[PDB]
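Progress note, project year one: complex with manganese (II) ion.
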Amino acid sequence: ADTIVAVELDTYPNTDIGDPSYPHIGIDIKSVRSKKTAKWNMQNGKVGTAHIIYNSVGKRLSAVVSYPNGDSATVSYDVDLDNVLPEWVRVGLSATTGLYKETNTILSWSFTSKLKSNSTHETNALHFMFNQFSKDQKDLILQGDATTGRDGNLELTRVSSNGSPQGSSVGRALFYAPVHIWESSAVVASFDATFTFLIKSSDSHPADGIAFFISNIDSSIPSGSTGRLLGLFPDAN
Amino acid sequence: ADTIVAVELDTYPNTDIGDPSYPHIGIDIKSVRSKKTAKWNMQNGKVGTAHIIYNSVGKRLSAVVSYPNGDSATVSYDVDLDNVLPEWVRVGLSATTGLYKETNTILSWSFTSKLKSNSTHETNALHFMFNQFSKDQKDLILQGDATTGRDGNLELTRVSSNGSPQGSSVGRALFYAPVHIWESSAVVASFDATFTFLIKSSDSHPADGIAFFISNIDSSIPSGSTGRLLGLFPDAN
Amino acid sequence: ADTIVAVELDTYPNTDIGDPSYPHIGIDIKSVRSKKTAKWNMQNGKVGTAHIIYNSVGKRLSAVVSYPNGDSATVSYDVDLDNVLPEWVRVGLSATTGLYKETNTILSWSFTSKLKSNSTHETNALHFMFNQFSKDQKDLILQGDATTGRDGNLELTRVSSNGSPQGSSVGRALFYAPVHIWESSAVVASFDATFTFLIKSSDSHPADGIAFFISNIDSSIPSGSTGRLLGLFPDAN
Amino acid sequence: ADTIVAVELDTYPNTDIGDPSYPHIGIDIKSVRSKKTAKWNMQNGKVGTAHIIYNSVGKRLSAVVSYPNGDSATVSYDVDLDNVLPEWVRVGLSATTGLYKETNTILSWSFTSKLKSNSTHETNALHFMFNQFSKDQKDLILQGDATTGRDGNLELTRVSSNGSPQGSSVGRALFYAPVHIWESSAVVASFDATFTFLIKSSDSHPADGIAFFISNIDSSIPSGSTGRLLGLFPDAN
Ligand SMILES: CO[C@H]1O[C@H](CO)[C@@H](O)[C@H](O[C@H]2O[C@H](CO)[C@@H](O)[C@H](O)[C@@H]2O)[C@@H]1O
Ligand SMILES: CO[C@H]1O[C@H](CO)[C@@H](O)[C@H](O[C@H]2O[C@H](CO)[C@@H](O)[C@H](O)[C@@H]2O)[C@@H]1O
Ligand SMILES: CO[C@H]1O[C@H](CO)[C@@H](O)[C@H](O[C@H]2O[C@H](CO)[C@@H](O)[C@H](O)[C@@H]2O)[C@@H]1O
Ligand SMILES: CO[C@H]1O[C@H](CO)[C@@H](O)[C@H](O[C@H]2O[C@H](CO)[C@@H](O)[C@H](O)[C@@H]2O)[C@@H]1O
Ligand SMILES: [Ca+2]
Ligand SMILES: [Ca+2]
Ligand SMILES: [Ca+2]
Ligand SMILES: [Ca+2]
Ligand SMILES: [Mn+2]
Ligand SMILES: [Mn+2]
Ligand SMILES: [Mn+2]
Ligand SMILES: [Mn+2]
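Model obtained:
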């Protein structure tokens, strides 16, 4: 199996797999069952923003989601990713729809990764920013139902010609280049991520959500990962 | 009295005032007595590097000091700085020598402050980088015995014409522009500071240390703050 | 007198003073009379964006102003600013109204400056970004009628409580910190400055314009510089 | 054939193919015969630095090569790359050795690409920085004799166990991700590239040079491109 570390924005509360009864954000290490969660009040048809942060020093992974206005949900989990993730990875965005559906749409995505060693300087860095996604995006690796170019946006899960979400959909987008996410000689290994999202659904129950993830370079959508598994895991275990 | 938040690299162990018996790094909130300290083995005559980090999300304040070849010391303190510092502040570097002395010398200093709000984007950023210092540095406010231009560096404590350190010395350097370190409307307020330094002492007991600090805009050296007070505090309380 | 270098967005064609017969963008070295200009059709009530760029390698000072919908204006001037400007300067925005008037309004402003020497690295840099302006902006120096806040914006010329622009009004906004614009040991010295604006005028003839400028550190508004002089130069020479 | 745009540091004067009689820096457009060249006094065994700069406003492609000791060489060419390079490209370094040899070695490399459209606040960007190279660098594609690690440098051309360069060698390193170097909707499309290098040669005549280039994504080393063709070109035309 792949190694996966993800921050999830969970619209659908699948409780039999361990999810809280409320839409929630959570931190996932190698399991669909978050190590930490926070109640999230999503505003249907609104553009939200998610900031994720980690530094090798404080060894605390953090995430915050917020809207204009407005309310915000914060979740933090103490971990040292040196001991979780492999040295090289790929980063990505993943979304699904189960029996219940919704529009999972990325307006913008940015990422920064810094390795600061004990030498001088010495800084290795990777930073990219998408404030929009063209029709043929070469620095993005698209998987499943994920497509770009529509209104300059990125649609993770299948959407019809009228702008209607689809059920049992899964899609993902990984950055083309592999990222060096830590090294043995780096005194500081840090990363920042940010994205904006529009989740719009029709029925009273949208599902299942959006997630930012880090996985081994060859990572791909596991089998039967639509709906509640959010595309990131083969099993709810 | 000023409101100070500082990261101290402490060369000389004043025990009577609460320090540990070994050279140590610490996190000081409004007191010379660190809330969190870590043991630090200083390599005399070598160029060290200090990475200070914070984000309003994890609300954890972190510090690391490293030398090439290995050997770093880490300290971290959970704090929400919205509740300590004023909205508008000035950042700088400070150093002292009491009865025991040492050369507190800065080869490089950089600073990055980001305010990201619940709107879109919208980011307010300030970032500066000093890879060397000139004779007249107009973007720096020098205080006390602090001088620049010598071998292209910044000297925080007084050094003789042969390169010898002096006792009972104190000095500081502040950035000219005030910094907006938080705003009530900012979902994320983050800051990152880095510096390289060379501490070189003759006698077996170097003193008293170096510190990176954030203070009120009008902040100035408190009377009689040399030696153990590191120039940052009027009193050892 | 002060040493000025400016990129001017000129709404009102003063042809006695040497301006072309149309609204124009221009490049002004130490004079209100542009060294170069290009025709600019401004869209009343629309938010535009100006991208200014200079590098000491190609020694070309370029400027472009664009609106949504993709029409723009471009001007470039071959110059070595080594021989024009003082080593240390201040950067800012300046606007005026004449008999005629308009709202000179700034939504966002960002500035990058990098001095890369023949050493290793060695990079000195300043970067600041304002995507909104607070009520009291301590890192800004307001001159004339320039004010901030109430909408989160900066108004360069006097505007009333109802939102109407005023005539014979002049105002400037400079960055607090003096910037090191160039050095003798610098192999490359380059700067980028961007800003967005909204120019709204009730009358058929908006005036007089908006300017991005670079000045000596003690530079202040000259006497009688409103209207056509754009709050930049003492005289029309 | 590939579409190559390059900035060459040419250590060997091949005058039958269009070179000047001195070692030089040059700007190549789809030809081994430069559009612009400059005289370059190279310091054997010294670490030099190259700064490549281009923006879509001034439309001037510039390059500067400087050494500690302050000496430098500068070349510029007026060109609009929209019409030359494909929308998506790949960026990299190339070096070769002919009958005459030399060590082509890279201590650091960095690259920055921005697309700023008329969309007001929408910027797409890619930035990467290598201050050193590990044994297996996954974000790099290595071609020919190019290798990494062991001192954390990048040798573009073959060097033996003792540190001696080899003849008839060719090597190239390309960043893994495809880079979006322009877009029809971008008002400003620019890029910066910087790298440090050490060229050492035993014999009195070092060859053949190092070059930074931008090509089609699938680009590979052309047959018989060693020596004078600098690994960039299939022929001397
Ligand atoms: C009524 O919905 C619950 O019961 C259904 C029948 O057993 C399940 O199909 C359903 O889960 C499926 O839909 C959800 C929501 O989209 C998805 O999260 C889950 O992975 C399944 O695809 C749910 O348990
Ligand atoms: C090493 O001497 C010890 O005792 C002296 C008193 O008898 C002290 O003055 C001395 O401290 C002074 O020097 C230290 C070290 O530089 C400095 O931290 C302290 O502020 C005083 O200036 C020390 O305790
Ligand atoms: C119709 O106004 C023009 O003619 C008037 C009479 O000669 C001028 O006073 C007037 O000058 C003022 O307005 C212009 C346009 O805003 C401005 O450029 C000038 O500096 C004065 O403010 C203008 O020429
Ligand atoms: C003495 O070398 C010159 O004349 C030789 C033929 O007698 C050439 O082969 C030689 O060119 C080869 O070496 C150069 C320098 O390494 C290289 O640029 C060229 O591509 C060939 O490999 C040169 O002209
Ligand atoms: Ca769920
Ligand atoms: Ca002490
Ligand atoms: Ca005018
Ligand atoms: Ca040649
Ligand atoms: Mn969940
Ligand atoms: Mn202490
Ligand atoms: Mn004009
Ligand atoms: Mn040549």
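The interface with chain D takes residues 47, 49, 51, 53, 55, 57-58, 60-64, 66-72, 74, 76, 108, 116, 118-120, 185, 187-188, 190, 194, 196 of chain C (CB under 8 Å).
Residues B 8, 10, 19, 26, 34 surround manganese (II) ion (ligand 10) (CB under 6 Å).
No further modelling is planned for this target in the current period.
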